[PDB]
Amino acid sequence: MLEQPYLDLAKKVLDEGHFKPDRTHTGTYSIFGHQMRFDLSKGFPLLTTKKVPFGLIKSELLWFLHGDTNIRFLLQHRNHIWDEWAFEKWVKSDEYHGPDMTDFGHRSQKDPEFAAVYHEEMAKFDDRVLHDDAFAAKYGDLGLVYGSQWRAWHTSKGDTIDQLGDVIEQIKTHPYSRRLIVSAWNPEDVPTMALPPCHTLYQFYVNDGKLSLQLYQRSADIFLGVPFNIASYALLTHLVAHECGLEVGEFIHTFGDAHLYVNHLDQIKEQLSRTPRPAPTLQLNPDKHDIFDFDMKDIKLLNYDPYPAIK
Amino acid sequence: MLEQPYLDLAKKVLDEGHFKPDRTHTGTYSIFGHQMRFDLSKGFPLLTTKKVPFGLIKSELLWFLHGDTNIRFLLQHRNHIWDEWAFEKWVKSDEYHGPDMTDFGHRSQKDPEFAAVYHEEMAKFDDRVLHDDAFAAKYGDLGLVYGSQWRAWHTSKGDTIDQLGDVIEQIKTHPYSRRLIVSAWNPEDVPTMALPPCHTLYQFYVNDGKLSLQLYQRSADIFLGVPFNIASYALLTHLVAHECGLEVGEFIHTFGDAHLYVNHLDQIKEQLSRTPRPAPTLQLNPDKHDIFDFDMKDIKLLNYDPYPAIK
Ligand SMILES: Cc1cccc2c1C(=O)N(c1ccc(C(=O)O)c(O)c1)C2=O
Ligand SMILES: Cc1cccc2c1C(=O)N(c1ccc(C(=O)O)c(O)c1)C2=O
Ligand SMILES: O=c1ccn([C@H]2C[C@H](O)[C@@H](COP(=O)(O)O)O2)c(=O)[nH]1
Ligand SMILES: O=c1ccn([C@H]2C[C@H](O)[C@@H](COP(=O)(O)O)O2)c(=O)[nH]1
């Protein structure tokens, strides 16, 4: 089945992973250099063995594809997956006049006391960002995230480059180029930025009218992140293939470090008892082609039949 | 044997490669996303099935490690592997007063007539570059090659960053970092530069006192380039491991496109009839540690017993 490489990776890290102490007084088990492949003609690799929310992936990917780094767009699609790094930058600032909450993320899931205070502070933030243009401009904007690396890379001359747009034009004119690359790794920013990008770089390749994509992912939360990551890049691959009029090939997912947190062990063991079902199919607006203008409604997933979400 | 992944890759491209017409009126056979691993504790992966010149690899790597982009240093070590792209930039200029030779590389191996004229023009160039500081400054310097990307990455603020030096300091202080990355891919230069780097990016990883390295290589001449490429990065891995006081782990070699030219087919078939021998061993100066100061003599290869070179 389409998703077996994900289960084999999880099982391999479980049975052969190396232990490393981790920053947040925990530990990981990891392996280096693992690869997964997914033939996208066999179905869409959204995990059946655990429910993965396709709507959040769609909206995040469309966000990136607009070159947008303002969480407002995500709030408008009911997507809170980027909230915390923005919440973090406002809560660290001068304009902020509520409870203390230094590292709200550690104290996050502990006492039910603070966890009611924070959830309302985040609920106010979200709403300010939604309706207050000036507040949104100031705290809604994450700065150096995928939207900017992919579509507005900042050059030394103060200008800005659309790597992905230029790449797509190359697929259309020079399909056999060996330079169909988009990087998110900027050696000038990486020493200071909040989040050196985990999805480091990717490359397309065309053969027999089919478009493949390989992603190099320097670091991977196998349980929480990977299942989202697989679906974003498989969707990216279909969307680019659609805009270029090509069929879809492989998605190849290559890791630097892939890890499992030492407290998440039983959740993934439980998942490894489940048996994949047939994979969903994707449908894209057959009459639209500029993916930089696609919206939620232009992307549909048929026949997705997952086991339940895990906690 | 240590080198079998190289022979399996060659054989896979031979038996399952996709044909693509190539720029220089030829064609390649290629595959996308292939990986090779080499456990560096089992020996040094310099190919036994074809002689590969370790001295040229050593000198090229030391060049990179100085942050140097002037071919003069290479000329002084009897290494001509970068000559042509420099020869190309002087022969295209105003100061040049010899025979015409537009695309000397196509006319290169054809008629023995021009091939005597060019070899002497290249022999004069090399000697000027060697003894004429001003000429060397002007035509010896390739500009954006590995030396500059790795050790003097140009920032927007007009400054310059030593990615590799900073990475090595991180290995020493934060060995379990998931950010031990050096990129050679600069989205601002890549649209114009002569040679968008083939050795796109690499990452280290440490476990149990052993240092591993993974390289992402976006494009690969399986017959001519790969055997050099494998030895440079395996040597890089040993050198960094030496400076940091670690043992050596895996070298993982991951490709975007890996190809074989459609006229090089029988050379690689002939090589596939040969049987690997035990791999050489590397010895490094046990009393020196700053690899940015290493020289030829600090690196020794024992017991390298190859079949003959191929043409
Ligand atoms: C699954 C997931 C889904 C949507 C968005 C994000 C993730 C995710 O894991 N991170 C993320 C980004 C950066 C870091 C980091 O600290 O470097 C992190 O731990 C998580 C996201 O922004
Ligand atoms: C095996 C090899 C050994 C040393 C140096 C070089 C190579 C090599 O293949 N190229 C190279 C670089 C760039 C291109 C390019 O045209 O992009 C190329 O064809 C070869 C080198 O500079
Ligand atoms: O799409 C993503 C983005 C991030 N991560 C994880 C990997 C790491 O656990 C964490 C970042 O910590 P560092 O590796 O960057 O130090 O984010 C994912 O799994 N998938
Ligand atoms: O270390 C290297 C450097 C380059 N190449 C080859 C791959 C391609 O044949 C060629 C560059 O052409 P493009 O792929 O860049 O277009 O250089 C290698 O095999 N090894």
Of residues A188, A178, A199, A176, the one with CA closest to residue B197: A178
Asked if B158 lies within 8 A of A155 by C-beta distance, the reply is no
Of residues B151, B219, B85, the one with CA closest to residue B74: B85
Q: Which residue of B has its CA nearest to A18?
A: B207
- At A261 the three-state DSSP class reads strand
Angle at B170 between CA B69 and CA B172, to 5 degrees: 105
Structural domains of chain B ordered from first start: 1-311 (3.30.572.10)
Facing A218 at nearest CB: one of B32, B203, B254:
B203
Of residues B89, B99, B101, B103, the one with CA closest to residue B137: B89
What is the spatial distance between Cα B113 and Cα B118, in angstroms, rounded to a whole number?
Answer: 9
Instruction: Choose from A36, A218, A222 for mutation: most chain B CBs within 10 A.
Output: A218
Number of H helices, E strands in chain A: 10, 11
Ligand 2 atom at minimal distance to the Cα of residue B196: 17
Please name the method used to determine this structure. Answer: X-ray
Which residues sit with their C-beta closer than 6 Å to ligand 1?
A 60, 81-82, 195, 221, 224-225, 228
Q: Does the annotation place B218 within a ligand binding site?
A: yes
- Full DSSP string of A67-103: T--BHHHHHTTT--TTHHHHHHHHTTSTT--S---TT
Q: Which residue of A has its CA nearest to B186?
A: A186
Q: Which positions ≥6 away from A41 have C-beta within 8 Å?
A: A210, A247, A248, A249
Angle at B19 between CA B14 and CA B22, to 5 degrees: 115
Asked if A158 lies within 8 A of B156 by C-beta distance, the reply is yes
Q: Does the annotation place B77 within a ligand binding site?
A: no
Of residues A28, A22, A7, the one with CA closest to residue A268: A7
**Annotation marks residue B198 as catalytic:** yes
Q: How far is A115 from chain B (nearest CA, A)?
A: 30
Asked if B256 lies within 8 A of A187 by C-beta distance, the reply is no
Instruction: Choose from B30, B189, B257, B259 for mutation: most chain A CBs within 10 A.
Output: B257
**Going by CA atoms, what residue is nearest to atom 5 of ligand 3?**
A220
With 0-12 / 13-18 / 19 or more C-beta atoms within 10 angstroms meaning exposed / middle / buried, residue A117 is middle
d(CA A283, ligand 1 centre) in Å: 27
- At B49 the three-state DSSP class reads coil
What is the spatial distance between Cα B260 and Cα B222, in angstroms, rounded to a whole number?
Answer: 6
Backbone dihedral angles phi then psi of residue B154, each to the nearest 5 degrees: -85, 120
Number of H helices, E strands in chain B: 10, 11
For tokens 């001359």, what's the residue? A157
| Both structure tokens of B21 | 């017409």
SS3 content of chain A, % helix, strand, coil (to 5): 35, 20, 40
**Going by CA atoms, what residue is nearest to atom 8 of ligand 1?**
A225
What is the spatial distance between Cα A267 and Cα B243, in angstroms, rounded to a whole number?
Answer: 40
**Going by CA atoms, what residue is nearest to atom 5 of ligand 1?**
A81
Asked if B252 lies within 8 A of A33 by C-beta distance, the reply is yes
Q: Which positions ≥6 away from A194 have C-beta within 8 Å?
A: A85, A88, A89, A144
